[PDB]
Amino acid sequence: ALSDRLELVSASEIRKLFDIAAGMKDVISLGIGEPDFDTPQHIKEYAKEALDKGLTHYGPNIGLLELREAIAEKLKKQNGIEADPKTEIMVLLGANQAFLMGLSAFLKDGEEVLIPTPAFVSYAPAVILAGGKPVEVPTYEEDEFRLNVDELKKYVTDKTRALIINSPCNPTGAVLTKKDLEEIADFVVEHDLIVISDEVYEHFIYDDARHYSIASLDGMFERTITVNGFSKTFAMTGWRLGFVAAPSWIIERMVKFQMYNATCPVTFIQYAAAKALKDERSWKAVEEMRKEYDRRRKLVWKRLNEMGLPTVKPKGAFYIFPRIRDTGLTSKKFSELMLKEARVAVVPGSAFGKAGEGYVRISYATAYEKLEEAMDRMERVLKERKLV
Amino acid sequence: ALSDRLELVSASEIRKLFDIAAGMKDVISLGIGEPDFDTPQHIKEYAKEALDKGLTHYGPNIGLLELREAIAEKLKKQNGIEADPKTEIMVLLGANQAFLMGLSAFLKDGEEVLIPTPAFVSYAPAVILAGGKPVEVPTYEEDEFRLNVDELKKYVTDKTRALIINSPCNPTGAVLTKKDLEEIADFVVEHDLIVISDEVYEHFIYDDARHYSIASLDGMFERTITVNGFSKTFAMTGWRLGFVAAPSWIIERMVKFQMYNATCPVTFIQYAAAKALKDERSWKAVEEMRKEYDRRRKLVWKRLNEMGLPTVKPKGAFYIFPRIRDTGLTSKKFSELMLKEARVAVVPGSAFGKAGEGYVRISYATAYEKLEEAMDRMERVLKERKLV
Ligand SMILES: Cc1ncc(COP(=O)(O)O)c(CN[C@@H](CCC(=O)O)C(=O)O)c1O
Ligand SMILES: Cc1ncc(COP(=O)(O)O)c(CN[C@@H](CCC(=O)O)C(=O)O)c1O
């Protein structure tokens, strides 16, 4: 039963870090998994307009049609994904809902779900809650943390039914290239898996990197649940609005699940997001945010490396994952030390899976000045403790 | 797995009704279970203020402390329930989320959950999804659909673990008396059950009915999950905001589940609700809504009985459940006929459980003028078909 599965889910290491950091002052948090920017004003204005228009009643379990149509257009233009807004697109209370609900549309007892690690903290627990068995597939820093099909093939079994992909990736910041996705797609097809693609950080890509969606690849829509949302893209984390595009049979089961869960997303919020998707100001805001994230990203990448922590330059999202194993400390002890002496909160790499052990996650979704200060604090401790 | 459980949950008779009635012209809908009133303007203003305050980021999984504190005050004053806002009160994306997540805090494989019927449609499916077995316990017209403990006694087994009660009740409008609850409390303690009490319609009570909360009774807090929310009370259905008060051990498990579900409720919406709870104008609006609901209630009760359908006068919520079995038609056939010929959509009582068969649910949460017309149309068809 669900209660048994919930008991199998381990307590959060990020939760533990927060509880401790909170009880201390002068601490700079680098464990934030959300934008620091406020929601663009014009979007706030669209929400106010929706409130004046009286859009405060229930909407379809699947989401407002107007929003689904706006999402279909965004998917087509930006991602090359063709999805019918009437049956293949569902709005959710944040993109986070997609994993538990999406997997519940097909996952059977004991079936395995390949989860490339380091991985976002929601994946494994969602698999366990759905009734399956999570199977971690390590990614390596020498591969810029890009998932390698060589690794997937070693961990796949006859019990494997799904694969969860995340690009741009949280916590590594890795971006899967088109060739990477083509190879993953072939593997997915070969093993008759359903692949869930988490693309919420799609717009925060840097350097020469481009965002490709696996569902846009030849014959992939029939076996892909594309997950995205407005939380990162429009700095709307507190608005709780995400969405998925998938075959209608999966969508039908997801709305059925929703009928006994959150029912439907916030009506006036959906109206604002539909208007936001078609407003040039929304995208100009996305560009400004990406620019600032990039400025902070170059700061932390250079500082981490120069202070003695080999760090892969992230190509997407707003996270960076420095190697800390050479200091002789475990990810947890490294985080404990930084919180106590540097007054800087970083997430132990192990929180993202075994492959994350030996690393630590730092989020640069915070003021540049705060980042400069946290870098100095961290470097001070590393050098004083002779860890570098 | 969840997918198998989901496959076991039967398709919704309500959506089937809504699908058909969707394309039909001139249909007066009496099957919508939500306030027709718009959200009070002052509450809309608090949300706009929250947007101006930049409350658009993540909030705690358990909800905004300010809102939890406001809820603790409301629960104490209005319900006599003493709950610690820091550990025993959780804010949700609508009260609907409480059943699946609340049950998942303890329900084991095959454990039975007593569900007095006619009952709200989310109960049985939530039990099934959680991994248990829903057991319907009939309530009767002669008892004004108030649950009788002697009936519960017929269904108890060694496997019984919980009971879900709803007062005021949807679809019957039944309100459990203080003595009903005292008797139910005894049975719950006797069998070491956890009782979930859905009190979302508490403010819409009429005649000599009064709202008691089972959790407020002697030693009941330790085994009760009180469910409530703002959807009905403040006409905030599209805002998706509800809550529960329960022992911390239950709350911890519900917050853990939320981490892999919707994460947290809408931040600016929670702020608006916290302020709304302490605003005198909110209760003024509630009273205004209750009086209007009462006006509509007397109209539909008079009309239904006088047209030939024996109907218990409801004492709470905004639903009325006329007896249709004497027409010789089933609930579904009666509903079909009304939609086809009267162009009025009513929900077949069977959608609320086996004990709902022979009845039909009507929602009077719609313009008084629309109700009059719907009553006339229904009466005309009953008379033409000599069903009455
Ligand atoms: C990779 C990824 N997928 C989904 C989500 C959920 O975002 P939603 O749209 O707001 O529900 C996340 C986001 N964020 C945090 C975890 C949740 C939180 O409230 O902090 C994180 O990155 O750890 C990510 O990353
Ligand atoms: C008895 C009862 N409990 C909970 C809810 C859910 O309210 P929310 O999640 O706070 O908005 C309800 C409400 N409503 C409907 C079902 C869903 C819909 O959109 O109509 C019903 O009455 O059938 C009730 O009734």
Coordinates of C-alpha atoms in Angstrom, one line a residue, chain A residues 1-4 6-7 9 12 15 33-39 44 47-48 51-52 54 56-58 61 93 96-97 100 104 106-109 121-122 125 129-130 232 236-240 253 255-257 259-269, chain B residues 1-4 6-7 9 12 15 33-39 44 48 51-52 54 56-58 61 93 96-97 100 104 106-109 121-122 125 129-131 232 236-240 253 255-257 259-269:
Chain A
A1 CA 0.0 0.0 0.0
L2 CA 1.1 3.6 -0.3
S3 CA 1.9 3.9 3.4
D4 CA 4.4 1.0 3.0
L6 CA 6.1 6.0 1.8
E7 CA 8.0 4.3 4.7
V9 CA 11.2 6.7 1.0
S12 CA 15.5 14.3 2.9
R15 CA 15.4 19.0 4.5
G33 CA 16.2 25.0 -6.0
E34 CA 14.2 28.0 -7.3
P35 CA 14.5 31.4 -9.0
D36 CA 15.4 34.4 -6.8
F37 CA 13.7 36.7 -9.3
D38 CA 10.2 37.9 -8.7
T39 CA 7.5 37.0 -11.2
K44 CA 1.1 39.5 -12.1
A47 CA -3.6 37.3 -12.7
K48 CA -5.2 40.5 -11.3
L51 CA -9.5 37.9 -10.7
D52 CA -11.5 40.9 -11.9
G54 CA -14.2 36.3 -11.9
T56 CA -12.3 31.8 -9.5
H57 CA -14.4 28.6 -10.2
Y58 CA -13.4 25.0 -11.0
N61 CA -9.3 18.3 -14.4
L93 CA -0.1 21.9 -9.8
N96 CA 6.6 18.0 -9.6
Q97 CA 3.2 16.2 -9.8
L100 CA 4.1 10.3 -9.4
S104 CA 1.0 5.7 -12.1
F106 CA 1.4 2.4 -16.4
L107 CA 4.0 1.2 -13.9
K108 CA 3.4 -2.3 -12.5
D109 CA 4.6 -4.1 -9.3
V121 CA 15.3 14.3 -5.6
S122 CA 11.7 13.6 -6.7
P125 CA 10.6 8.4 -4.4
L129 CA 5.3 5.6 -4.5
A130 CA 4.1 4.3 -7.9
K232 CA 11.7 28.3 -13.5
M236 CA 6.5 31.4 -10.9
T237 CA 7.5 28.7 -8.3
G238 CA 4.9 30.0 -5.8
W239 CA 2.1 29.9 -8.6
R240 CA 2.2 26.0 -8.7
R253 CA -5.1 8.2 -16.5
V255 CA -6.6 13.3 -15.1
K256 CA -8.4 10.3 -13.5
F257 CA -5.6 10.4 -10.8
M259 CA -9.8 13.8 -9.8
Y260 CA -8.7 12.1 -6.5
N261 CA -5.7 14.4 -5.8
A262 CA -5.6 18.2 -6.5
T263 CA -8.7 18.2 -8.9
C264 CA -7.5 21.0 -11.1
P265 CA -4.9 23.9 -11.2
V266 CA -5.7 27.4 -10.0
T267 CA -8.1 29.0 -12.6
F268 CA -6.9 32.6 -12.6
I269 CA -3.3 31.5 -12.5
Chain B
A1 CA 0.9 -0.8 -8.0
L2 CA -0.9 2.5 -8.2
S3 CA -1.7 1.9 -11.9
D4 CA -3.6 -1.3 -11.0
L6 CA -6.3 3.3 -10.6
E7 CA -7.6 0.7 -13.2
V9 CA -11.5 2.8 -9.8
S12 CA -17.2 8.8 -13.2
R15 CA -18.3 13.4 -16.2
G33 CA -20.9 20.9 -6.9
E34 CA -19.4 24.4 -6.3
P35 CA -20.5 28.0 -5.3
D36 CA -22.0 30.1 -8.1
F37 CA -20.9 33.2 -6.1
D38 CA -17.7 35.0 -7.0
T39 CA -14.9 35.2 -4.4
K44 CA -9.3 39.2 -4.2
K48 CA -3.3 41.3 -5.4
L51 CA 1.4 39.7 -5.5
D52 CA 2.6 43.2 -4.9
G54 CA 6.3 39.5 -4.1
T56 CA 5.6 34.2 -5.5
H57 CA 8.3 31.8 -4.3
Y58 CA 8.1 28.3 -2.6
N61 CA 5.5 21.8 2.3
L93 CA -4.2 22.2 -2.9
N96 CA -9.7 17.0 -2.0
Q97 CA -6.0 16.1 -1.6
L100 CA -5.5 10.1 -0.7
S104 CA -1.6 7.0 2.8
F106 CA -1.4 4.6 7.7
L107 CA -3.6 2.4 5.5
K108 CA -2.2 -1.1 4.9
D109 CA -2.9 -3.7 2.2
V121 CA -17.2 10.7 -5.0
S122 CA -13.5 10.9 -3.9
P125 CA -11.3 5.9 -5.1
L129 CA -5.5 4.2 -4.5
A130 CA -4.1 4.2 -0.9
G131 CA -4.2 0.4 -1.1
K232 CA -17.1 26.4 -0.3
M236 CA -12.7 30.0 -3.6
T237 CA -13.0 26.7 -5.6
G238 CA -10.7 27.9 -8.4
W239 CA -8.1 29.0 -5.7
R240 CA -7.4 25.3 -4.7
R253 CA 3.6 11.6 6.5
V255 CA 4.0 16.5 4.1
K256 CA 6.4 13.8 2.9
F257 CA 3.8 12.6 0.3
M259 CA 7.1 16.5 -1.4
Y260 CA 6.5 14.1 -4.3
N261 CA 3.1 15.4 -5.3
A262 CA 2.2 19.2 -5.5
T263 CA 5.1 20.4 -3.2
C264 CA 3.2 23.2 -1.5
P265 CA 0.1 25.4 -2.1
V266 CA 0.1 28.8 -3.9
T267 CA 2.0 31.3 -1.8
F268 CA 0.0 34.5 -2.5
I269 CA -3.2 32.6 -2.3

